[PDB]
Symmetry: C5
Subunit: 393 residues, 5 copies
């Protein structure tokens, strides 16, 4: 009879047992040939050391029992069979820490020599070690290891579909504009063993990704450069005005409020902070020097029952530092008038010695303003020198 070509499928699955590993001779292994394309990097968790990706996967193997001649079946050379009717190998990942939700694919291809092809997408929640020592300019190297979980090397061996050079140079479908950049995917065959007499075939894929360091660079420099500019403008306040101290402590208050927002959005691993955490406490201690310079000079020019300064410490300040660096009734009358002259004289002499301290506090202020402005320019061009040698190639 010739009803249709559903007479192939019941010829092929009349007495078929889906629990038996499909070989005629039990001494020969089943060889599974796999292949991978990366599709998206969904999440990189630096705190929990967990990577979440999404790949497209395919594999084939040889089934000794699903064979037919294409004649006597109207030249059919392949057909589709449900997945839960045949033997399927158990290929897992060593680095699993969870189970991702993936769509179910209910069909496979079967060619007329026994080659069974399986296509399925996979969401992977794996665990890889993440070092963040140079935090925005970092390249990560995480691994995917496909292996058979039960069967040993004498039952299931794993090979590649195609050559490892075609797998390495494949970035055709990768979803970009998403904060991570795929560089390469490199395969490598190894053989796993913990104890003796049990070896397991495995196939490591190394996934190398790189962070796009643009929006971390503007969301961490644009407040850092800004609060340095406001500190430079605050030196132009005169120190005997009672406002420079209140300026510097408010701005130092507003800067410490900023760092606790930075640590809220930027994590750190068990080795500690990255290298840019050093460059924040250098800009922190550079404001405490400007605070200690203000408190040192407000103590200087202030009116406390003063004496005339040291003639040694006036001579090499006023003269040298501006040249090397900068540019019965009758006689009862005048006895009372001499007393009135005396109270005005002590008022004037305490006033002119307050001027001599005030002249010292202004030559020494423009001296320390130019030393501070020299240090914040030498450190600023150092920070852009190290960046510009990175950016080339």
């Amino acid at each position: 009879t010739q009803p249709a070509l559903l007479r192939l499928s019941d010829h092929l699955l009349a007495n078929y047992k889906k629990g038996v590993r499909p070989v005629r001779d039990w001494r020969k292994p089943t060889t599974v040939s796999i292949d991978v394309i990366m599709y998206a990097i969904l999440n990189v968790d630096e705190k929990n050391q967990v990577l979440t990706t999404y790949i497209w996967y395919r594999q084939y193997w040889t089934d000794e029992f699903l064979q037919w001649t294409p004649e006597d079946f109207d030249n059919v050379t392949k057909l589709s069979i449900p997945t839960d009717s045949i033997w399927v190998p158990d290929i897992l990942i060593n680095e699993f820490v969870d189970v991702g939700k993936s769509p179910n694919i209910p069909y496979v291809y079967v060619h007329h020599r026994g080659e069974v092809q399986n296509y399925k997408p996979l969401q992977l929640v794996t665990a890889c070690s993440l070092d963040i020592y140079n935090f925005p300019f970092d390249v990560q190297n995480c691994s995917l290891t496909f292996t058979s979980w039960l069967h040993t090397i004498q039952d299931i061996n794993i090979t590649l579909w195609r050559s490892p050079e075609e797998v390495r140079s494949d970035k055709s479908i990768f979803i970009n504009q998403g904060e991570w950049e795929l560089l390469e995917v490199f395969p490598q065959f190894k053989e796993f063993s913990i104890d003796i007499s049990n070896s397991y075939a495995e196939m490591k894929f190394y996934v190398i990704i790189r962070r796009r360091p643009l929006f971390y660079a503007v969301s961490l420099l644009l407040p850092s450069i800004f609060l340095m500019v406001v500190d430079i403008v605050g030196f132009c306040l005169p120190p005997d005005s009672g406002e420079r101290v209140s300026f510097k402590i408010t701005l130092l208050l507003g800067y410490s409020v900023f760092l606790i927002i930075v640590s809220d959005t930027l994590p750190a691993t068990a080795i500690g902070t990255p290298l840019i955490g050093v460059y924040f406490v250098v800009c922190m201690a550079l404001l405490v020097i400007s605070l200690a310079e203000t408190i040192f000079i407000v103590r200087l020019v202030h009116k406390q029952d003063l004496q005339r300064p040291v003639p040694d410490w006036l001579r090499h300040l006023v003269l040298d530092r501006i040249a090397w660096i900068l540019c019965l009734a009758v006689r009862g009358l005048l006895q009372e008038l001499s007393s009135i002259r005396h109270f005005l004289e002590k008022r004037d002499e305490m006033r002119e010695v307050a001027r001599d301290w005030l002249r010292v506090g202004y030559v020494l202020d423009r001296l320390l303003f130019r030393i501070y402005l020299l240090a914040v320019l030498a450190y600023s061009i150092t920070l852009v020198t190290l960046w510009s040698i990175w950016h080339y190639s």
Copy 2:
């Protein structure tokens, strides 16, 4: 016998095999005709580049084996059959990154020529690229690509149910008032291929949505306009009062606290900030100019052992800038009295030279108050000019 019309269903499913693709001739493909109505936009994730929608889906195909004449079955022309008793094609989406939870529909229709109709709702968690360069006034363009995952173009081809003009103009059931606005849904047929000799039918639906920019506009201008008004009122403080500097640094402190709440609720992609991030740092640097204008003028009118100002720099300030822009016992007595006259004279001459600097600091203050008020009005009407040319049509 005539028991009921359950004698149709066992005639139709006596020897039926749900794993075989239902054709008499294996050389002809099965053609699936699909159709879509968008129901809700559930979530748009700008950070992770993930779109979450909810659609209503339907499809039909032709089954060669489910055919009957309507006579000898009491004129039955269609009936309902459980879904897990027949062959169902595997239509997926390329852009899946997750599996949404959808209700199960356990029945299908079957007409008497073999047409099998399937209705089901779907929740879709897809991945599309989102550019936010003009952040509240942005139109997104994300894609849905329906394809068969295993079968090639020689087995399953995908067509539309109805015309592509009826699909494009369908906004009948879309749930509004929910922060996104559906513009159109446009279908397009393509043919997918990565390697040679394997082509897959696909059907792209382009979903174009647009953000409603109302409550982002009031939750970002109403604090931005407000802290500009408070800065204008603070110029009316007199500069030799010791409070204008403390006014400006508190208000600049409270403005920098505001931006870190803005970045907490407004994300940015890998290309960086949107265009309105430029318009925040222009309003930022416009407050530092008002801070540097205060510190420049407090340094001017302040009492430090002063000299009389330059007659050149007084003449074109006091005169020109207000006209072009603005509107033995006896002889021992008087020798002591001349000394008492001398201490009061140095007290008065240091007082009148502090007035001459104070007159300079007030002509120059109302000059810089009108230049600053001219710039904050020219920039404010520029910002509403660019908005009003957008709003028309």
Copy 3:
């Protein structure tokens, strides 16, 4: 034989096909009678427009094939049958956006005329439109629409179990004390159609709920009334003390910190803020008037090389505003003494003209203190007048 009364169930399920819609004549529809009691309002999401409830559901229909006479089965009139052995209709909701987790009920009742009764609880995650224009005093109106997803009006029709007046007045089991208050549940029959020749039976239940506006009212007035009381106490500071300006800007700083916590806990839809967002910016601008009143009067009473004020602007201030509203050696001596008289005279005349400005700044201060206190009392009793007409009935 008479073994037991398991001989009923195998008589009833010997040749039973659970895929066939159970009618003798295929032209007559199956009528499903439903009923609902609301149990809890779990979540109302104003941002995503999503409602989450939990109901108790029941339904019955007529099965033509499950019929027996109660004699010859020892007078059994009903029995329980597993759910997955019989035909069950597919009743869904139009407003689904998710799938809730509900317990499984594995049994149904079957009476001896064919009536099959089904009881099950359901968790529903639906989508309804939420307007929050009057934010704590708001009544919402969301919908639940039970319909058959595949079968049309010629196969499945939906009716009510009991009368629509018994469904409307049922609040027996509703879990209270949980921030929402159930008012009524009102049913209504409609008939759904998008295209021609396909009509679907549906049954809308309108669920009307009302927010309990107690703890939103104390967590939004008790800081709003408090920072108005502190502003009233701050007018009693004297204006020529240098502390009133620093008082008002700190309190205005602490008030703007408060609103960004309010917007963090209170959402807004696409139409913008509710009506109480207007009543916050009225209390905002009422503090800027008190700030501008302080800066206007500190500029007035301050010692800058002053002149005597206008006699017109002193006469209607000092006199009128307090009445209509408030309540050779010898001749060389005295030439020097006349100079000493002259320096003390210019010191005294600049002191008495600073008193005349100081008298103006205190009559005008108590005038503007009573105008401000009149406005904050007229607006406060207006705000309680609008509340008291709401509270009655």
Copy 4:
């Protein structure tokens, strides 16, 4: 033959129907005997009124069809059978609002008289009413009601395994150190009915738990006591120094910042705040009195063109309050000298009347410092008196 004792299980399950309620006579109900041990309190959600626990559950019933004599089966008196091969009753909870994830137990015991024993653990997500009127010192009373969802009182009745005194005094395995303390679990039998002619057996377990109020007490008093101590130290500043007002408004600013962190971590139900919310606004208004005492006394001792105070209001302040509570050329000369005497006399008389107001502002300051220190000590020992009568027994 005697192969093994798998000949018992096929004798026992040859013709067994798992859909039939297992009685010989259909008029007799099946009696289910249950038992509970509480294992952990996982979550108590005060906002959503949801309790999450984890119990260990067991139950037995009598199966008329699973009976054998132990002879002719090698003295087997019990054996284990898979769960999905026999009839299982449907015991649910009325208070479900979700479905918890519990491990599956695939086996049951069967004794030779028909007693079928079932052991399983359960995670329960229920809804109970939570009153938090005394927030850390609160005892909650939530309920668990086990009932049959479909079958009425004529089919399934629920009893206890063991006595209700053994269930009440069982705290053997409860995981402690986890913020809630289990007091007792008390069972009670009732009979549920909404309409007539349908009654359902139920079994309420009352679960009484109590919060451990230790770390809420130190995380709410240690900032509350601290900002009261800082306010006491700030009275020792002299009031005519211009810093006491700036002290009090900064500290009142920092206290209002603290309460918005308290409301972020401590929820409130629909009845409003707990009783300790009253004790925060008493400590709030106790700082406004210290603020209004400062502003009242800075207005007093301040130099505005003053007059001598009232002799009545000086006599009962300076004298009484310290005793009852505290402890041609020649004649042209002296006409000019009398003028110079006159300008120094008006300078001195305006200075001594500023001392007389300054003496009033210091007797009245130490008076109001001791009244304020008496109120903050009488309220502090009241707050520890109410705590110490609670702590005993």
Copy 5:
């Protein structure tokens, strides 16, 4: 016939019953030998007392019914069988509070004597008690107890695969760099019993882990050391400048803002705060002493109608504390001139007595500056002494 070696599997599973515990004699128990390797510590929840790990698990037992001679089956000594075709024991954990998501392994090994080997990975969500008394330097000790949930000691007994010394010293695959450090895994056999006549075999594994205390130590000392350095610099302000009080209250404000971020990220159990919570309130009260030292000395050097100080309290301050520790018309003229001498004399004598109080306030200031600097150095080297004795071994 000799078709293949699928003739072994149908010989082995022709009449096999997967519900029967596989023994020939029912009096002998089934012995299960287990083994564990820890792979990752996923989460340690200190608030909810919940541990989340991920292990690799394996077990074997003896099946009396799956036996064959390897001859007459072409020398096959083992083969793989699906898991859902044979009897599997029910090994659970006592400490479950949830169900983790683990991958499914669908195959087992079967040797020719009946030994059935099972390999599977497991995610475990257990509940262990966590004491955090020494918060970063803490070692936890949580438990895993494998037991059979239904069967007693006469049915299932649990043993180890390999020796307990090989299990204890196994850290081969543990994923490091993830904030917790695995020390050892120690097994122990016990026997569980609540009531009489029912004993259950169990096998406790003790898991000892240790926190890596590096990044908690820098994120809690680097702001704590920093705000102590800023307080030392603030003593160099002169006390009669009106800025030291405003310095100390701003810095004390900014320190109390810091602790509420610390408690947000660091939890505490029911016993209260850890030991480092004591070391924060010691650094808290060390700033209130510096605040009370400032307010005590501003009250001292301030100009209120002063008297000369006590000669006893000047002698042991000025002299001792610097030595032991530190280093008709005519007669009408002069009657008026004596009055002018009198007003200048009272002006001078009130000025020199303000100097004598000012000298006292500076000897006493450098005295209390060196006592405070001695206490903050003795406590700082104590804090590093206790750390250095911990770090050695």
